[PDB]
Design an enzyme around this catalytic site. Structure first.
Site, PDB file in Angstrom:
ATOM      1  N   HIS A   1      -6.253   4.543   6.513  1.00 20.64           N
ATOM      2  CA  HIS A   1      -5.666   5.510   5.580  1.00 20.64           C
ATOM      3  C   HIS A   1      -4.184   5.863   5.923  1.00 20.64           C
ATOM      4  CE1 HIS A   1      -9.335   6.021   3.349  1.00 20.64           C
ATOM      5  NE2 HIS A   1     -10.005   6.076   4.505  1.00 20.64           N
TER       6      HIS A   1
ATOM      7  N   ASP B   1       0.835  -1.185   0.000  1.00 17.75           N
ATOM      8  CA  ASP B   1       0.000   0.000   0.000  1.00 17.75           C
ATOM      9  C   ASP B   1       0.869   1.234   0.000  1.00 17.75           C
ATOM     10  OD1 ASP B   1      -2.880   1.123   0.185  1.00 17.75           O
ATOM     11  OD2 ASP B   1      -1.921   2.106   1.903  1.00 17.75           O
TER      12      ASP B   1
HETATM   13  C1  LIG Z   1     -13.165   5.322  -4.684  1.00 18.34           C
HETATM   14  C2  LIG Z   1     -12.223   5.332  -3.486  1.00 18.34           C
HETATM   15  C3  LIG Z   1     -12.495   4.123  -2.585  1.00 18.34           C
HETATM   16  C4  LIG Z   1     -10.762   5.388  -3.938  1.00 18.34           C
HETATM   17  C5  LIG Z   1      -9.739   5.490  -2.800  1.00 18.34           C
HETATM   18  C6  LIG Z   1      -9.678   6.876  -2.156  1.00 18.34           C
HETATM   19  O1  LIG Z   1      -9.833   7.894  -2.827  1.00 18.34           O
HETATM   20  N1  LIG Z   1      -9.388   6.895  -0.855  1.00 18.34           N
HETATM   21  C7  LIG Z   1      -9.312   8.136  -0.096  1.00 18.34           C
HETATM   22  C8  LIG Z   1      -7.996   8.842  -0.309  1.00 18.34           C
HETATM   23  C9  LIG Z   1      -6.817   8.295   0.185  1.00 18.34           C
HETATM   24  C10 LIG Z   1      -5.594   8.897  -0.057  1.00 18.34           C
HETATM   25  C11 LIG Z   1      -5.532  10.057  -0.811  1.00 18.34           C
HETATM   26 CL1  LIG Z   1      -3.974  10.735  -1.174  1.00 18.34          CL
HETATM   27  C12 LIG Z   1      -6.709  10.629  -1.296  1.00 18.34           C
HETATM   28 CL2  LIG Z   1      -6.688  12.118  -2.188  1.00 18.34          CL
HETATM   29  C13 LIG Z   1      -7.929  10.026  -1.044  1.00 18.34           C
HETATM   30  N2  LIG Z   1      -8.415   5.064  -3.248  1.00 18.34           N
HETATM   31  C14 LIG Z   1      -7.578   6.030  -3.978  1.00 18.34           C
HETATM   32  C15 LIG Z   1      -6.395   6.499  -3.131  1.00 18.34           C
HETATM   33  C16 LIG Z   1      -5.214   5.508  -3.019  1.00 18.34           C
HETATM   34  C17 LIG Z   1      -4.078   6.196  -2.260  1.00 18.34           C
HETATM   35  C18 LIG Z   1      -3.343   7.330  -2.989  1.00 18.34           C
HETATM   36  C19 LIG Z   1      -2.728   6.952  -4.316  1.00 18.34           C
HETATM   37  C20 LIG Z   1      -3.057   7.654  -5.475  1.00 18.34           C
HETATM   38  C21 LIG Z   1      -2.515   7.293  -6.700  1.00 18.34           C
HETATM   39  C22 LIG Z   1      -1.648   6.215  -6.790  1.00 18.34           C
HETATM   40  C23 LIG Z   1      -1.308   5.513  -5.646  1.00 18.34           C
HETATM   41  C24 LIG Z   1      -1.830   5.887  -4.415  1.00 18.34           C
HETATM   42  N3  LIG Z   1      -5.613   4.177  -2.515  1.00 18.34           N
HETATM   43  C25 LIG Z   1      -4.511   3.236  -2.215  1.00 18.34           C
HETATM   44  C26 LIG Z   1      -5.253   1.912  -2.075  1.00 18.34           C
HETATM   45  N4  LIG Z   1      -4.467   0.679  -2.173  1.00 18.34           N
HETATM   46  C27 LIG Z   1      -6.228   1.978  -3.255  1.00 18.34           C
HETATM   47  C28 LIG Z   1      -6.564   3.467  -3.393  1.00 18.34           C
HETATM   48  C29 LIG Z   1      -7.988   3.816  -2.944  1.00 18.34           C
HETATM   49  O2  LIG Z   1      -8.661   3.033  -2.290  1.00 18.34           O
HETATM   50  K   LIG Z   2      -3.783   3.608   1.885  1.00 14.25           K
END
Ligand SMILES: CC(C)C[C@H](C(=O)NCc1ccc(Cl)c(Cl)c1)N1CC[C@@H](CCc2ccccc2)N2C[C@H](N)C[C@H]2C1=O
Ligand SMILES: [K+]
Ligand SMILES: CC(C)C[C@H](C(=O)NCc1ccc(Cl)c(Cl)c1)N1CC[C@@H](CCc2ccccc2)N2C[C@H](N)C[C@H]2C1=O
Ligand SMILES: [K+]
Lengths: 211, 212
Positions: free
Chosen positions: A172, A13
């Site tokens: 997160h 992750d």
């Molecule tokens: C539809 C939803 C559920 C998507 C979800 C998400 O938006 N969650 C909230 C969030 C977390 C961190 C940031 Cl920074 C933000 Cl703005 C918003 N996401 C995307 C974020 C990325 C993490 C950031 C990232 C971005 C591009 C490339 C690598 C990593 N995660 C990693 C995981 N294994 C799969 C994905 C996930 O579940």
């Molecule tokens: K994460």
């Protein structure tokens, strides 16, 4: 040519400055290497195996995190700089390869929604360093693809809540999400392993997010 | 020549095949690098800092663990082999240096009873690879010496934790569980701990190898 059974599952992750449309940079990464015997021959939430290799690192992204990224992950470029964090460089890639080299091959990276987020961003970071084929030894699986096959929201929290009727700790954070992913993959460990062994994809087929 | 204030405190702990009199070999190690600002400017048991670098690895020791070592650490050489663990080698020494190179200098290793156990065993393992000077740049402090000085009684990790937080720490006798419990103990009076470390850090080159 075919690899045979995956010997190590590297639960993975990353946190970033933002979402893919902003051309994000890594701010945090966690790698948790678990031998296949911990899943095929295990001893409400299952305990993690006693024998694991773990690596959690914070990375200076070189640009600001979006305000959304900071609120959700608790990281900001300014706080990373206060903590003297270095950027994603040659030494960081050399560190990642040295950690993976301690694991019996074939290696399989496992990431929740890995195909759209963690895998292309890892590829983009390596490509920016001129190391486009650095992790081409590895295999990869998206645990969403895996858990849909074994059985509605397929978010890490939703899957966790449905199996263990509780919210996972330290959500997160790269390490917290990796530990939550592991517990989810330990629900039906023999079934998850057989799917991985049959559907692991070469990491080189992952195109970089940008560049 | 003066190093100045330590920029990173790397909380360190190791498991081994047995006690020093058996010329033991590392079976597990944990490094938790915490920038000094986490202890000088912090925001019952204190929570760990949000920003940390962590490395926890298991190591194939090359020989049997003593029945005592297996009962206490939950590790055996046979179980380490089933999990396909590699020995303490050149790649492990490059992995540790690459991890420490991500940390601002001066670096200071912090291990509970480190002078007698963790620090001479790490030097012995590095010397066996022909890398006697590999970590000369680093500094080290024994947190037993630091906490005796802070309280100025049992000074074991468990006893200090119970005297401070009125409860026993989880995952005791695992390299990570012990690194995390030590971190909690050092977060009790973080400014006083940091002030002491800065005044008494000693160069890692002054640590002789346990054997060899
Ligand atoms: C539809 C939803 C559920 C998507 C979800 C998400 O938006 N969650 C909230 C969030 C977390 C961190 C940031 Cl920074 C933000 Cl703005 C918003 N996401 C995307 C974020 C990325 C993490 C950031 C990232 C971005 C591009 C490339 C690598 C990593 N995660 C990693 C995981 N294994 C799969 C994905 C996930 O579940
Ligand atoms: K994460
Ligand atoms: C007098 C007591 C209080 C010493 C105490 C101890 O006997 N506890 C039980 C035990 C644990 C593991 C094993 Cl394997 C055994 Cl048999 C026995 N010890 C020694 C063990 C080492 C761990 C192994 C080791 C051995 C040689 C060199 C590096 C590491 N620990 C690491 C810690 N930072 C300081 C020291 C400690 O507190
Ligand atoms: K220990």
């Amino acid at each position: 040519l075919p690899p045979g059974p995956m010997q190590t599952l590297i639960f993975f992750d990353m946190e970033a400055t933002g979402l893919p449309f902003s051309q994000p940079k890594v701010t945090e990464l966690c790698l948790l290497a678990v031998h296949r015997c911990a899943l095929e021959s295990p001893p409400t939430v299952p305990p993690p195996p006693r024998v694991v290799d773990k690596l959690s690192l914070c990375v200076a992204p070189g640009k600001a995190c979006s305000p959304a990224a900071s609120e959700i992950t608790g990281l900001s470029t300014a706080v990373l700089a206060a903590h003297g964090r270095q950027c994603f460089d040659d030494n960081l890639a050399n560190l990642l390869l040295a950690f993976l080299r301690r694991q019996p091959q074939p290696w399989c990276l496992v990431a929740h929604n890995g195909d759209r987020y963690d895998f292309p961003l890892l590829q983009a970071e390596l490509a920016m360093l001129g190391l486009t084929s650095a992790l081409d030894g590895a295999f990869c699986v998206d645990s969403i693809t895996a858990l849909k096959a074994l059985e509605k929201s397929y978010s890490l929290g939703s899957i966790y809540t449905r199996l263990y009727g509780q919210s996972p700790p330290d959500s997160h954070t790269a390490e917290g999400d990796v530990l939550a992913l592991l517990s989810i993959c330990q629900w039906r460990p023999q079934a998850l392993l057989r799917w991985v062994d049959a559907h692991a994809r070469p990491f080189g087929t992952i195109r970089p997010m940008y560049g």
